[PDB]
């Protein structure tokens, strides 16, 4: 949708999903054009080139449980020839310093994670933006969880 045809994608989290991270391209200000596909909750790359990859997730909680809570966000690649998932971007956050004691209020907290960087991809690479705790995911508002790529060379 521009004079110089260029692979681009910007998908958002499904608000109707029940405690799960499901990417969609079906709302205002979410796009999926010029060969980039979405299969099995993954982004399929159409051309070899230098891509900008970015993603944001937003987590929310009420209080802290007895187990330590680690929040991870990771963008990974599956090559057309390689074996498994190589991590491109990854970040970890620890929102809970200690368990909410009995008799104390379960006060809410929010934790966003942003990932972005430029990577050379070959035609047919799969890209996945995953979290480790979908139950802490927060898609109460529109622009809070998203996952996008855009080719800068070809």
């Amino acid at each position, epitope marked *: 949708r521009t004079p110089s045809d260029k692979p681009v994608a910007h998908v958002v989290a499904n608000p109707q999903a*029940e*405690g799960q991270l499901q990417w969609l391209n079906r709302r205002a200000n979410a796009l999926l054009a010029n060969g980039v596909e979405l299969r099995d909750n993954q982004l399929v790359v159409p051309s070899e080139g230098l891509y900008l990859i970015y993603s944001q997730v937003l*987590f*929310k*909680g*009420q*209080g*802290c*449980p007895s187990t330590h809570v680690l929040l991870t966000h990771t963008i990974s690649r599956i090559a057309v020839s390689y074996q498994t998932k190589v991590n491109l971007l990854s970040a970890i956050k620890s929102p809970c310093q200690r368990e*909410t004691p*009995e*008799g*104390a*209020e*379960a006060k*809410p907290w929010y934790e966003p994670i942003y990932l972005g960087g430029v990577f050379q991809l070959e035609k047919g690479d799969r890209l996945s933006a995953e979290i480790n*705790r979908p*139950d*802490y*995911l*927060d898609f109460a508002e529109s622009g809070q969880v998203y996952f996008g790529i855009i080719a800068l060379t070809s």
Partner: antibody
Amino acid sequence: QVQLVESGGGVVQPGRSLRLSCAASGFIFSSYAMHWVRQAPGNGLEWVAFMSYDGSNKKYADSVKGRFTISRDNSKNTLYLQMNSLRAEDTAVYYCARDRGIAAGGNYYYYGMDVWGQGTTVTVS
Amino acid sequence: EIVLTQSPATLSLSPGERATLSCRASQSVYSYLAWYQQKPGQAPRLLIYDASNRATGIPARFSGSGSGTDFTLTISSLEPEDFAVYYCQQRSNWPPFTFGPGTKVDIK
């Protein structure tokens, strides 16, 4: 010493209203979330309502949405359930229970309802 | 959206035998599942929370296990006090705090 004591149930004609009370004692009531859970005669348990420690999050069962209203008074340390337009299916024993309110994304709640009231009977027919 | 099944509906055993109660969910609920005991004429009583953790003051014969869609409550040796109705509760939001149908345990 940690106890919940309910009151207010009774025999009501259909379509009228009735207000259930659940006074807490022995613990910091203002820090706990609260649930209403009812049990029809000879049936199992059915969750009715829920509210957080300050009332920011309220949840209702589909069968009672639009007719029941859960509320609380932390200075009196009491939980309230307002029941309007009572049908026959609302005839049940009603329990209140406390909950730590520790949750993930406001959707998944850890632990469980550990202390309950003695229950109060509501009969509509 | 989420449907709770409990098998079997009725379990008739003798004191001392192993009791195996099953709770299944139509969709995955992670480990946000609890087990409650209700004796005749009393309020419910929390047995297990978060699938496998035993509540305070609960005898060691009760044990919880399972995750996602499959959960199991095991009583290694039935006592006379244990004959009651047992409910599993999924603690997700869709729909919120739904109880299972319950499993009654009686004598032979």
